[PDB]
Amino acid sequence: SDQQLDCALDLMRRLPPQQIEKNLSDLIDLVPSLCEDLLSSVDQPLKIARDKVVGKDYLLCDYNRDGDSYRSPWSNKYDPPLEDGAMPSARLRKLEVEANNAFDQYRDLYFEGGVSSVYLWDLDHGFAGVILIKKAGDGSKKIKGCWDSIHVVEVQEKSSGRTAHYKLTSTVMLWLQTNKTGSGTMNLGGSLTRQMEKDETVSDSSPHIANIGRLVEDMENKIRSTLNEIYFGKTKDIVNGLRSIDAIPD
Amino acid sequence: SDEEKVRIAAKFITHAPPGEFNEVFNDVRLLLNNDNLLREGAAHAFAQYNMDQFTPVKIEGYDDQVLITEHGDLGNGRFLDPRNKISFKFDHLRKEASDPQPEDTESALKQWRDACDSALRAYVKDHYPNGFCTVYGKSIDGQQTIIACIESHQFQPKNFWNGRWRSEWKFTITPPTAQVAAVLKIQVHYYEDGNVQLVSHKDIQDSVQVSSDVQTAKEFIKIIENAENEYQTAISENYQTMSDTTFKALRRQLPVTRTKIDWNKIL
């Protein structure tokens, strides 16, 4: 079980990234004992639901989940409905709404489409949150892709609330596929996780969301840079070592 | 369900990235935890993996290596090495050749085969750093066929990456013409920073003229070389296109206004 976990994780890192949902399902079909452990620690594509009250999309993750229901950031209601689903405090809920709006603009500006959601929760010496972004690239038989990012941030207020410590853990999943005459079918799939910690000043002009916004924006700009190198540089260098157009000397 | 478990185990083993079979096999063994069932329904998978991957193998006493492919499958666990005129038993588990025996396959296409083999080996030595190839000459549904197979790999677990190139070219010879059917495949796994896989393939269907064995093999190799150069050049062009365009359409580097966001304004 402890070792079976290690094996099921290593296996999911090694199988085809386009097959996560099927492979993971299949992997649950043979060690059901690790079902919950697998569902939470394996990177999966983000799922979208529609808020039935106001008709807007939101994203699903474990942090807006209670039992088999999920809480919408728009209406603050669970679906399927629950009498006593876990809710943020009135004060945290206010900040959650400000965060959803600010990150919606961030998404519009860097992604020009897709869906984003933010859910917050309380901690002893501050709070935490998740920022989810999904942008799919549909509209061509020749070229397809999808970006999914998840950012977990932990905030610890310090110096009587004049500064705070921020801890960010971010994962981006990225898939691309082209079907062209010269290069045939090319499929690139995978992911990258990064962590960053910063103290920043907190004030009227630099409030928590602005600090979280800057932290997430930088993290995604750095991750994007690194994926570019790894996806379109490293794998290419490896292709070019398998075969050489010019004759190999000696 | 137990028939379904083995079927899943077998699907998993079959999808091992090049150079990572042992790891995937180990994972799947400890997971199924039924070493008995593993041997039963997932032995068709070891063989299927070896033949899909064009696994190269060294036979004691012969300089080259030969590729394990469906084309050299003689049945009953034996494979043909057409260059050396031997058959051998292959142990798909250990990946070891043994019991080499002479095999004089009835020489109908043999001259053609030997002339293609000779031109292909020189080509593969010139263009594939650790490349191996095998040429078969066989009759398929009545038609004389040359099947040229090329494998090249680089396994660098210490640098956290593996890659493999496979190509397969089938020339159905009906003088003075030949039908050409090829498939080129590439697979790369890089996991030193992050984790990414490239899977790529290209199908080719064409026709060409043929004359004598020696001249025709020379031109088969020119056709292969050009087509494989074309794919490789298109691949690197497509890399540039995905980098500067397709990636941008998912997430830009900067907003349209080309300034980092002003978070106070947004708030």
Author numbering:
A (entry chain B): 2 to 251
B (entry chain A): 9 to 275
What does the paper say about this structure?
CP is a heterodimeric protein composed of α- and β-subunits and the molecule displays a pseudo two-fold symmetry due to the resemblance of the tertiary structures between the two subunits. CP caps the filament with its two independent actin binding sites at the C-terminus of each subunit (“tentacles”). V-1 and CARMIL proteins directly bind to CP and inhibit the filament capping activity of CP.
To gain insight into the structural basis for the inhibition of CP by V-1, we solved the crystal structure of CP (chicken α1/β1) in complex with V-1 (human). Three conserved basic residues in the CP α-subunit, Lys256, Arg260, and Arg266, were shown to be critical for the barbed end capping. Arg260, the center of the “basic triad,” forms a bidentate salt bridge with V-1 Asp44. In addition, Lys256 and Arg266 form salt bridges with V-1 Glu78. In V-1, Trp8 on the V-1 helix 1 inserts its indole ring into a hydrophobic pocket, which is formed by CP (α) Ala257 and Leu258, immediately adjacent to the “basic triad,” and CP (β) Gly138 and Ile144 in “loop S5–S6” (a loop connecting β-strands 5 and 6 of the β-subunit). The structure also indicates that V-1 lacks uncapping activity, because the V-1 binding site on CP is buried deeply between the two end protomers when CP caps the filaments. Conversely, we found that the conformation of CPV-1 is significantly different from that of the CARMIL peptide-bound CP (CPCARMILs), because the binding of V-1 induces a twisting movement of the CP-L and CP-S domains.
